[PDB]
Amino acid sequence: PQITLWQRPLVTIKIGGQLKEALLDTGADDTVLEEMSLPGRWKPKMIGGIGGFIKVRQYDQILIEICGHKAIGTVLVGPTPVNIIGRNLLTQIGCTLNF
Amino acid sequence: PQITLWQRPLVTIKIGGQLKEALLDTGADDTVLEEMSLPGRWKPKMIGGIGGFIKVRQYDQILIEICGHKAIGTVLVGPTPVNIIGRNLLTQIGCTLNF
Ligand SMILES: CC(C)CN(C[C@@H](O)[C@H](Cc1cc(F)cc(F)c1)NC(=O)O[C@H]1CCO[C@H]2OCC[C@H]21)S(=O)(=O)c1ccc2nc(NC(C)C)sc2c1
């Protein structure tokens, strides 16, 4: 699809058997999901944004279906206030910016 | 231009007579710029991101030239680590997401 930006670019995703909404975020290097129960093993990690840092659990090779497109990659889980799809997954669904 | 997301989507901007680099950020409602000398009046404001909140100064009706496209709107100034062009200005230059 083509998505204009008059509203937040929110898409339906499916990950770890659950349905969620997430923001398509070109300013996010990585994918950060709010607290949720993922199956695999994880690694502790800290990541930085506007107001400082948050600790997250890093899961690798996680499968996500973003608006009907499948992708596998790293997912970070922790106290983000918004589910964010970052560029590590946007490149897999072929996402681009156009103006 | 069409911009793929294999690297950060950085653009050159001109704002307040100064040249800066800034991120095209579909996950940002608003435009927030690192500390810089801007002329005019401003309202104190507090915005939230991944690690908490930051106080910024809010300037309205500010001219920005973004990759050669002119836009006018609200610019927030404060302790962001990267300059972010948010959706309030992205819509003005016709920017869309495509996949
Ligand atoms: C700041 C930017 C450079 C990175 N930010 C992505 C932005 O899109 C966030 C996304 C968001 C939306 C949201 F609604 C709430 C949030 F809390 C966060 N927007 C945002 O802060 O917007 C603020 C201000 C503009 O107005 C409003 O917009 C909505 C809220 C206000 S990040 O989330 O901090 C992030 C993500 C991934 C990531 N991966 C890493 N890798 C490491 C290894 C280096 S570092 C890193 C950091």
Side-chain angles (χ1 to χ4, degrees), chain A:
Chain A
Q2 160 153 282
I3 307 185
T4 62
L5 298 164
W6 307 96
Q7 310 264 316
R8 278 185 181 189
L10 297 165
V11 293
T12 304
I13 75 179
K14 184 179 178 187
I15 175 168
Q18 295 148 78
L19 309 182
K20 300 183 174 301
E21 300 232 273
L23 190 65
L24 300 176
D25 188 350
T26 61
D29 299 333
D30 303 303
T31 294
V32 194
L33 305 183
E34 304 198 63
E35 206 311 296
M36 73 172 284
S37 56
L38 270 168
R41 73 192 316 279
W42 54 273
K43 310 175 168 301
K45 198 182 191 173
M46 292 211 39
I47 65 184
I50 292 265
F53 61 74
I54 62 156
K55 282 214 72 103
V56 301
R57 328 198 287 281
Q58 172 178 333
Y59 296 77
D60 296 341
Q61 268 252 316
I62 301 286
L63 163 71
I64 304 99
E65 298 148 39
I66 289 134
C67 206
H69 293 59
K70 292 182 196 120
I72 294 192
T74 294
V75 180
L76 309 185
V77 183
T80 171
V82 177
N83 292 322
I84 290 151
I85 309 304
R87 292 188 296 104
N88 72 296
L89 296 189
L90 299 174
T91 53
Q92 290 191 49
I93 68 191
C95 201
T96 63
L97 277 170
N98 289 342
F99 68 100

Side-chain angles (χ1 to χ4, degrees), chain B residues 33-99:
Chain B
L33 296 198
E34 80 204 337
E35 184 52 52
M36 88 174 50
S37 43
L38 229 61
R41 102 278 177 266
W42 61 269
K43 309 247 174 184
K45 188 163 138 175
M46 197 156 19
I47 62 177
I50 207 90
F53 289 74
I54 63 158
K55 326 188 197 163
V56 301
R57 316 193 310 269
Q58 165 183 342
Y59 298 79
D60 307 304
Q61 198 87 28
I62 303 315
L63 166 73
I64 307 198
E65 300 194 54
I66 290 163
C67 208
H69 298 61
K70 297 182 212 132
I72 290 190
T74 295
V75 176
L76 313 179
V77 181
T80 178
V82 309
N83 302 314
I84 290 137
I85 312 300
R87 297 164 31 240
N88 73 311
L89 297 187
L90 293 176
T91 55
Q92 274 191 61
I93 70 182
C95 190
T96 64
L97 280 174
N98 314 79
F99 63 96

